Amino acid sequence: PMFIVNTNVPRASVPDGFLSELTQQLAQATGKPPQYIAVHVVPDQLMAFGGSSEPCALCSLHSIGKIGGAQNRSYSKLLCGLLAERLRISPDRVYINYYDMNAANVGWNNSTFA
Amino acid sequence: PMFIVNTNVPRASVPDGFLSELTQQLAQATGKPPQYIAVHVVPDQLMAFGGSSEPCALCSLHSIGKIGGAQNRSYSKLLCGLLAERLRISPDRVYINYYDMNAANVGWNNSTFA
Amino acid sequence: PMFIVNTNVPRASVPDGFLSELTQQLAQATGKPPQYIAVHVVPDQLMAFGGSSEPCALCSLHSIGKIGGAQNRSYSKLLCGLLAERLRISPDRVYINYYDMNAANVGWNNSTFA
Numbered sequence: 001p002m003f004i005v006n007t008n009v010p011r012a013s014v015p016d017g018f019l020s021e022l023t024q025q026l027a028q029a030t031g032k033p034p035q036y037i038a039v040h041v042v043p044d045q046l047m048a049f050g051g052s053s054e055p056c057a058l059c060s061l062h063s064i065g066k067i068g069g070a071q072n073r074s075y076s077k078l079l080c081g082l083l084a085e086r087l088r089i090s091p092d093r094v095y096i097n098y099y100d101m102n103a104a105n106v107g108w109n110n111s112t113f114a
Numbered sequence: 115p116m117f118i119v120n121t122n123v124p125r126a127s128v129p130d131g132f133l134s135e136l137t138q139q140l141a142q143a144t145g146k147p148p149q150y151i152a153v154h155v156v157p158d159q160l161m162a163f164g165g166s167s168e169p170c171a172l173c174s175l176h177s178i179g180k181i182g183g184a185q186n187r188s189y190s191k192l193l194c195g196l197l198a199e200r201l202r203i204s205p206d207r208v209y210i211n212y213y214d215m216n217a218a219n220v221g222w223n224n225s226t227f228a
Numbered sequence: 229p230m231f232i233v234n235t236n237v238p239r240a241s242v243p244d245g246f247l248s249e250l251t252q253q254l255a256q257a258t259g260k261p262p263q264y265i266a267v268h269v270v271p272d273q274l275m276a277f278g279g280s281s282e283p284c285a286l287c288s289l290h291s292i293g294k295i296g297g298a299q300n301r302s303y304s305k306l307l308c309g310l311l312a313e314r315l316r317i318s319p320d321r322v323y324i325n326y327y328d329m330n331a332a333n334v335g336w337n338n339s340t341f342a
């Protein structure tokens with residue numbers, strides 16, 4: 001799986017260890033080994049949400065399976081909680097798009113997972 | 115909805131008010147409230163279009179519904195017009211990918227829209 | 229088509245000519261004219277893969293058609309090979325998501341490809 005967070009919060013406010021925390025919490029949440037979890041945080045972005053440039057986060061989670069109605073509600077509660085505690089972004093300013101990828105459409109290690 | 119523009123034009127060439135114009139014009143085009151709209155502009159990117167490093171943009175619009183053949187033609191005319199007028203990017207050096215999101219695949223405020 | 233690479237490799241380690249090499253190789257691989265190939269490289273990113281900050285890449289290829297089981301295996305060998313040769317990223321630290329776009333969902337030049 002791959003989790004990407006784009007945010008207007010400054011780089012210095014991303015705590016040391018945040019990528020590791022995302023890696024471990026997503027490995028547990030998705031039930032996949034951490035070897036397969038990639039995370040990417042992009043601070044200092046020029047963005048607005050609802051017309052306001054107060055702190056916000058625009059995110060995506062792509063996974064081969066482990067995506068669905070109940071699972072995504074669980075991920076949204078987990079990820080909003082982490083972004084609130086660690087980046088001080090209010091949960092009503094976190095927006096997450098979820099993607100269930102087919103294995104044939106994910107490349108890795110010179111081939112694909114199909 | 116979420117609208118992202120990635121471009122090689124420099125940050126200083128992004129005029130004041132640009133995120134607000136995107137929010138307001140996308141609210142009218144999609145019919146969605148400005149409250150639900152996120153906009154994100156990423157200048158100074160290392161990009162080429164058609165083998166050329168002249169000004170270009172790669173963009174995406176994600177929305178729960180309000181995506182379709184006629185609507186996407188209308189969005190493309192609106193958004194290329196804004197990128198030409200405000201960033202001086204030729205419309206034939208702009209790509210916009212459109213994504214009709216299922217409500218269950220959009221998280222916000224500790225939940226999803228399922 | 230559009231190919232995007234996000235990587236933690238520093239900008240100085242992206243060799244001269246890399247975007248042009250990607251354009252030409254993807255034009256041949258997808259069978260589309262180079263005029264239609266857009267490429268975007270994002271170095272210096274804050275990313276982890278498998279819990280490690282060793283060099284890695286998260287990429288996507290979007291194309292109207294020319295996406296499939298066999299084709300995506302071929303693209304993955306080609307692109308992992310380029311990332312290993314040119315950016316020194318191990319293929320087991322690369323993900324590439326593939327997107328077969330409907331023509332109506334790709335905007336260009338004030339309209340769409342539909």
Ligand SMILES: Cc1c(-c2ccccc2)oc2c(C(=O)OCCN3CCCCC3)cccc2c1=O
Pocket residue numbers: 050092095115149150151178217220221222227
């Ligand atoms: C930001 C925000 C959003 C929103 C966030 C991200 C993306 C989209 C919207 O939805 C909301 C919503 C709500 O339900 O938006 C969507 C539900 N909607 C039902 C019918 C079909 C289309 C989807 C309600 C109150 C405040 C809000 C709100 O303050």
Ligand SMILES: Cc1c(-c2ccccc2)oc2c(C(=O)OCCN3CCCCC3)cccc2c1=O
Pocket residue numbers: 035036277278280282320321
């Ligand atoms: C992410 C990552 C992965 C990996 C990614 C997804 C799934 C599985 C692994 O494998 C690796 C590997 C590796 O799997 O190598 C195999 C050889 N290995 C040699 C020594 C004895 C055991 C076998 C090596 C280095 C970095 C890595 C590495 O950074």
Ligand SMILES: [Cl-]
Pocket residue numbers: 001002036062063064106
């Ligand atoms: Cl995955």
Ligand SMILES: [Cl-]
Pocket residue numbers: 015016017018019020
């Ligand atoms: Cl970190």
Ligand SMILES: [Cl-]
Pocket residue numbers: 067068069070071072
């Ligand atoms: Cl589920």
Ligand SMILES: [Cl-]
Pocket residue numbers: 115116176177178215220
């Ligand atoms: Cl939406």
Ligand SMILES: [Cl-]
Pocket residue numbers: 181182183184185186
């Ligand atoms: Cl339509």
Ligand SMILES: [Cl-]
Pocket residue numbers: 214215216219
């Ligand atoms: Cl969806």
Ligand SMILES: [Cl-]
Pocket residue numbers: 229230264290291292
């Ligand atoms: Cl295409």
Ligand SMILES: [Cl-]
Pocket residue numbers: 295296297298299300
């Ligand atoms: Cl195929």
Ligand SMILES: [Cl-]
Pocket residue numbers: 328329330333
């Ligand atoms: Cl599509």
Ligand code: NA
Pocket residue numbers: 050051133134135137138148
């Ligand atoms: Na506004």
